[PDB]
Design a protein around this nucleic acid. Structure first.
Length: 94
DNA sequence: GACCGGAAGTGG
DNA sequence: CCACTTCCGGTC
């Protein structure tokens, strides 16, 4: 797979029919996984990695902290916030 | 349990 | 190369 997790989360987030498992909620960029497990099995599907689970996916998100692509929303389960500072950069090619 | 981050490894 | 994937030893 060549798609990126943040890109894929957005894809999902861009249709509200997927709200049964992920949804925008809060200030600009915030969202929460209403079904963390379905999100993971989907990402797994998409990347042909079928042992994907939330514990692994969440690790990948944690890596995004240093990249400023995302922060954790503190004291809110399964909630993160996209940050534009780093998205801007990750949208740039070579 | 959830969340954190180090470390090794992987495959488009 | 690099963004993950896998796994794990810690904090609550």
């Amino acid at each position: 797979g060549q798609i990126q997790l943040w890109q894929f989360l957005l894809e999902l987030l861009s249709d509200s029919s997927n709200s049964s498992c992920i949804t925008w909620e809060g200030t600009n960029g915030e969202f929460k996984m209403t079904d963390p497990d379905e999100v993971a099995r989907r990402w797994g599907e998409r990347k042909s990695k079928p042992n994907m689970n939330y514990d692994k996916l969440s690790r990948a998100l944690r890596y995004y902290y240093d990249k400023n692509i995302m922060t954790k929303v503190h004291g809110k389960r399964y909630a993160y916030k996209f940050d534009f500072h780093g998205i801007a950069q990750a949208l740039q090619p070579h």
